[PDB]
């Protein structure tokens, strides 16, 4: 019976991590969108 709890819980953690990486990478792409030209390479490595 525990498995449903495993679903809601562990997938809550998973969807949380997804909510992190996705929208944070929107913030990332936006940082790229700051570009009049050159990208901040070290910053990009920080992103990675």
């Amino acid at each position: 019976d525990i498995s449903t709890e495993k679903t809601v819980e562990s997938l809550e953690a998973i969807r949380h991590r997804i909510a992190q990486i996705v929208q944070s990478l929107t913030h990332f792409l936006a940082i790229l969108h700051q570009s009049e030209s050159l990208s901040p390479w070290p910053t990009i490595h920080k992103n990675f």
């Binding site: 792409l29 790229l32 570009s35 030209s37 050159l38 990208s39």
Partner: protein, 94 residues
């Protein structure tokens, strides 16, 4: 029956017969064909008059070229489909 060609007007009795005139039509045209920039094109309007002059002098007095026939002329377009950076890295990354 050339009126069957005029039945395009009968098609205009069956349709609006396209938007025809439009400033936007002049905008895609601002993109389309030689040259570009309507002001610069206006500077080119005399040169455009030159385009209507001897630039169009080419005519028809040569071999029919059977090798060109027929749908293979499109196959040449397929040959175009085959035989024919800053930001861009970041672009494709996006």
């Amino acid at each position: 029956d050339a009126d069957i060609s005029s039945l395009s007007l009968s098609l205009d009795p069956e349709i609006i017969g396209g938007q025809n005139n439009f400033l936007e039509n002049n905008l895609q045209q601002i993109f389309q064909k030689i040259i570009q920039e309507r002001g610069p094109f206006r500077d080119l309007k005399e040169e455009d008059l030159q385009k209507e002059l001897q630039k169009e002098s080419i005519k028809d007095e040569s071999s029919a070229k059977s090798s060109e026939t027929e749908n293979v002329l499109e196959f040449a377009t397929l040959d175009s489909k085959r035989n024919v950076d800053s930001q861009a890295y970041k672009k494709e990354l996006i």
